[PDB]
Amino acid sequence: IVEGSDAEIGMSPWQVMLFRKSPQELLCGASLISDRWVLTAAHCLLYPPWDKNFTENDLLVRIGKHSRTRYERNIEKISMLEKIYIHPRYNWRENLDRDIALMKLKKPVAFSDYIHPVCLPDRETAASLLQAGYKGRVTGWGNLKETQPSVLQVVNLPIVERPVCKDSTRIRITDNMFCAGYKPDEGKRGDACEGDSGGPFVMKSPFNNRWYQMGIVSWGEGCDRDGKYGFYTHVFRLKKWIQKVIDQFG
Amino acid sequence: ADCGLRPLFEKKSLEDKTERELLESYI
DNA sequence: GGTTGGTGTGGTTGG
Ligand SMILES: *C[C@@](*)(O)[C@H](CCCNC(N)=[NH2+])NC(=O)[C@@H]1CCCN1C(=O)[C@H](N)Cc1ccccc1
Ligand SMILES: *[C@@H]1O[C@H](CO)[C@@H](O)[C@H](O)[C@H]1NC(C)=O
Ligand SMILES: [Cl-]
Ligand SMILES: [Cl-]
Ligand SMILES: [K+]
Ligand code: NA
Ligand SMILES: [Zn+2]
Ligand SMILES: [Zn+2]
C-alpha cells in the first residue's frame, strides 16, 4: 500500500494473510467471507509466468493478525486449506480477466472482536455504490513503494469512470474489472502495490451501515504513478460463480 | 447474516479515523 | 497484563 496509513486495531477484522507453508513466507492478502471460506485473487495461487502453481498443502492462512513479527497468542488464528477453487475462465495469459479464487478452510474460525466476515454485494447494493467518484478502501501488507510495513496499511480511493480507466493503459480492460485512484492532480495520491493482491476493496453502505467487498486488488503498472490507476476484480460481476462454489462445496 | 459489522466500531457506535471521508464522497 | 496463560535466558512471540 503506497501512501496509506496504519490501521487501528479491529478496523478490518475480515483481513486474511496468505502464507507459503514451507518456508514461511507472506504471499498475498485475502478476505474472510464466512467462517469457512476465504476470498483472494487467482494470480496469488496460479501464475505460470512467475512459475507459480500452488496446491492446498503448500499454504496456510493467518486471521486476526495485527503484527508482522509477533504471534499474538489467543488473538490471531491459523488454518490450513482443505480445498482451493480458481475461476475456470481466469485469463492469466492476457489481462488477468476474472482474477479470483475461493479457499475452503479445514476448520471454521470462531468470530471475535478481531475476526469477522465482510459482506458480499447483491445487485441493489452494487448498483448504488459502484459509481465513479464514490470512494472505497483498500488494505494490505504489500510494498510501501514501487520496486514491508509492520502494521496493516490502509488507503481510501475513488472509483474512476471506465473510459478513463481504459484510456490509461494498453492492456485490454473488461467488464470483470474496475479501476480506482486519483486523477493527475486532484492533489491526493495513493495506491495498492505488489504483495497487496487478494486484499479487499471495501465500501461502507450508507443504507444499513455494513461493509461490503466490491473488489479484489488485482494489478497495475508501477505503483501510485501519475495518470495510472490501480485495477480490481469486480466481485459482484462474478457473484454467481462465487455462490455456486460455496453452495456446492460448502 | 453476521457480516460487515465490526465489534470494535459499529457495534460500539464508534467511527474509525477515516470512514467519514467515504461517507462524504457519496454526497 | 495486554486485545491473550502460565511461566522465559521463551514460546510459533516483545518487553
Ligand atoms: C499479485 C499482486 O500482489 C499484484 C498487485 C499489484 C497492484 N498494483 C497496483 N498499482 N495497484 N498483481 C500483479 O503484480 C499482477 C500479476 C501479474 C503482473 N501484475 C501486474 O500487476 C503487472 N504489473 C501488470 C500485468 C502484467 C501481465 C498481465 C496483467 C497485468
Ligand atoms: C498446476 O499444477 C497441477 C498439478 O499440481 C496441474 O494439474 C495443473 O494443470 C497446473 N496448472 C497449470 C500449470 O496450468
Ligand atoms: Cl513449481
Ligand atoms: Cl521447481
Ligand atoms: K508473554
Ligand atoms: Na496513480
Ligand atoms: Zn518450478
Ligand atoms: Zn458476530
Side-chain angles (χ1 to χ4, degrees), chain A residues 136-153:
Chain A
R137 168 183 294 178
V138 194
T139 46
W141 265 288
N143 291 347
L144 291 162
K145 78 282 248 57
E146 185 181 287
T147 59
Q148 68 218 286
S150 53
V151 170
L152 185 62
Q153 298 286 305

Side-chain angles (χ1 to χ4, degrees), chain A residues 189-206:
Chain A
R189 4 169 31 78
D191 198 2
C193 198
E194 283 75 26
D196 292 320
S197 296
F201 174 106
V202 295
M203 296 183 82
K204 174 156 177 171
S205 169

Side-chain angles (χ1 to χ4, degrees), chain A residues 111 116, chain B residues 2 11:
Chain A
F111 307 155
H116 257 82
Chain B
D2 178 14
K11 260 64 127 296

Side-chain angles (χ1 to χ4, degrees), chain A residues 27-28 41 43-44 47 50 92-96 99 171 191-198 217-224 229-232:
Chain A
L27 305 162
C28 271
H43 85 258
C44 288
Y47 194 62
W50 292 346
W92 54 264
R93 327 246 174 181
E94 187 199 341
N95 56 4
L96 299 171
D99 191 7
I171 296 283
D191 198 2
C193 198
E194 283 75 26
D196 292 320
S197 296
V217 172
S218 181
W219 59 272
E221 297 176 289
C223 303
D224 199 38
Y229 301 91
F231 285 68
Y232 302 72

Side-chain angles (χ1 to χ4, degrees), chain A residues 8-11 13-14 112-114 116-119 129 133-137 156 182 203-204 206 209-211, chain B:
Chain A
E8 305 159 69
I9 293 151
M11 117 178 281
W14 37 77
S112 74
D113 287 348
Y114 317 100
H116 257 82
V118 65
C119 313
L129 302 191
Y134 288 3
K135 296 177 173 160
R137 168 183 294 178
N156 298 335
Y182 293 100
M203 296 183 82
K204 174 156 177 171
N209 212 214
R210 297 177 186 262
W211 294 94
Chain B
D2 178 14
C3 63
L5 298 180
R6 309 168 293 181
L8 270 17
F9 293 90
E10 288 75 22
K11 260 64 127 296
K12 295 179 82 182
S13 299
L14 306 152
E15 286 189 2
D16 63 49
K17 281 189 284 165
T18 64
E19 56 175 284
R20 167 154 308 166
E21 191 189 342
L22 304 187
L23 291 28
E24 292 174 26
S25 79
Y26 295 132
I27 60 208

